[PDB]
Design a protein around this ligand. Structure first.
Ligand SMILES: NC(=O)c1cnc2[nH]ccc2c1N[C@@H]1[C@@H]2C[C@@H]3C[C@H]1C[C@@](O)(C3)C2
Ligand SMILES: NC(=O)c1cnc2[nH]ccc2c1N[C@@H]1[C@@H]2C[C@@H]3C[C@H]1C[C@@](O)(C3)C2
Lengths: 285, 277
């Protein structure tokens, strides 16, 4: 629950954000090296807005209990009893985006549909906590084992007003625009329905095995093209025309049709993660 | 943007102080009574200290933008008046007492959620309210409340996280924190203590007989009225769990009332802990 700074042995780095970083550590009080591996998030060179949002993240994660969401283990009040480090579980198999590219050969559609379903269940639970993840993408999905994946990176995650179902972000997005829904791009509006849009994209990522040559980045930039209008503005224009990501190579038709529903123009017309769950689970049987 | 005195029709009094008063008016330049209502504040027989502070007050509130903080509207000028929006349902304390049958526990969480968010934003503007209490919260609609009364609200120095009031406040002792009561230290963490008391008010539906004052008074021979409370807060005594209060909210009030300000939760941490119940 409470992690002594001196017993967190640093090993190496897992990610370096713009205002923060995630370090792989071993919490080893006993010295014999049997202590558990943990991911530890902390801030660097950050202003007041980030420190405050970082404190929201810790509470949101502390409060999420699901097999399909990465585990909060504790916090550490750090060197000089001043700073703040967020301690989480370490999953050694790594992120899904990298895992699919490496082990592509030993993984068939069934296994891909298992992942999708676990993620969908995870996202259904986040809905139930009135929580919008806001950064759902293969790079933030972790692999617990070859048959278990988890959702991670709650940095952009936000709870809804208790009386409303949507939320507006005052400062616009910085994370890749290719997972963002149109109302998010045009108006910085976010919701469970917006997360449903992004889940369409992770299905695409999944069934393209995160192959870089047909990534959302890769595909949209080929459709947007270069012409000066900003890249955010022309993607939106592309999306309002009704243009979407194309059917992946060898994609099961009925999976591509579920994406299309995730990507409906109006948020009210996208299926809930509750509607999607069974639809994924009993696609073939 | 700026209001004319001759177009401000006086209606009735909203509040009064030892050196200040607030008035309800319709700003009615067309003269046909279709103007908007406004709460208008000004000073009366005050000293230079009050006039100075009142300008600070105008300028802070002028620059606050939150759906949970009463909206500065403008000013009217020889002697200055602060014009604000008028919320017609009045303050929360009187509302909770009047409409308790109509309001369930879930909606008290919503008012809590919204006050915390207002206090979070005041925190980010490096600003301390000093008089957080239900008597200073306003009802915009049945599902929306707003913080008001920035009379005693002070901005923290740019390079420090606390403020010291050399001339202490005559306003009620029961909302104050132990460092306030003892050494006049005010801070964002002080505002957290008082939020704890605001929670108590909410979940007791601002019932008179079990007010913070009434309850703290019941928990106390004769010495000074102040130095009995501080001696009692430093023992460990706190306000009771209200009857119409969930367990986990009472735990948030006790955390809010930790002895050391450093141990008390931020409004940033509190928020989710309220919203996720
Ligand atoms: N609990 C964890 O966060 C975590 C657990 N096991 C891991 N194994 C490899 C990375 C990694 C973790 N964090 C990484 C960090 C945050 C997020 C997710 C990972 C990849 C990313 O790019 C984006 C940087
Ligand atoms: N702009 C306003 O402040 C305001 C707006 N709408 C209102 N409707 C009823 C009172 C009232 C207002 N002021 C009151 C005044 C200051 C403060 C808040 C209110 C109650 C109090 O006791 C403490 C006296």
């Amino acid at each position: 629950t409470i992690f002594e700074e001196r017993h967190l042995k640093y090993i190496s780095q897992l990610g370096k954000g713009n205002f923060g970083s995630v370090e792989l550590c071993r919490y080893d009080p006993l010295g014999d090296n049997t202590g558990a591996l943990v991911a530890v998030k902390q801030l660097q060179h950050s202003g007041p807005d980030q420190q405050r949002d970082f404190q929201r993240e810790i509470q949101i994660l502390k409060a999420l209990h699901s097999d399909f969401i990465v585990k909060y283990r504790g916090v550490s009040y750090g060197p000089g009893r001043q700073s703040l480090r967020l301690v989480m579980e370490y999953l050694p198999s790594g992120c899904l985006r990298d895992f699919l590219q490496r082990h592509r050969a030993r993984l068939d559609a069934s296994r891909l549909l298992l992942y999708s379903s676990q993620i969908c269940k995870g996202m259904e639970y986040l809905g139930s906590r009135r929580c919008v993840h806001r950064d759902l993408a293969a790079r933030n999905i972790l692999v617990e084992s070859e048959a278990h994946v988890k959702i991670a990176d709650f940095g952009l995650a936000k709870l809804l007003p208790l009386d409303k179902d949507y939320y507006v972000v005052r400062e616009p997005g910085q994370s890749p625009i290719f997972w963002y829904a149109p109302e998010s791009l045009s108006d910085n509006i976010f919701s469970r329905q917006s997360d449903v849009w992004s889940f369409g994209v992770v299905l695409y990522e999944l069934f393209t095995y995160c192959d870089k040559s047909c990534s959302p980045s890769a595909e949209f930039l080929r459709m947007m093209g270069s012409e000066d209008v900003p890249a955010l503005s022309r993607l939106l224009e592309l999306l309002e025309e009704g243009q979407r990501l194309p059917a992946p190579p060898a994609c099961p038709a009925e999976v591509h049709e579920l994406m299309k529903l995730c990507w409906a123009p109006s948020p009210q017309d996208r299926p809930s993660f509750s509607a999607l769950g069974p639809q994924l689970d009993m696609l073939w049987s």
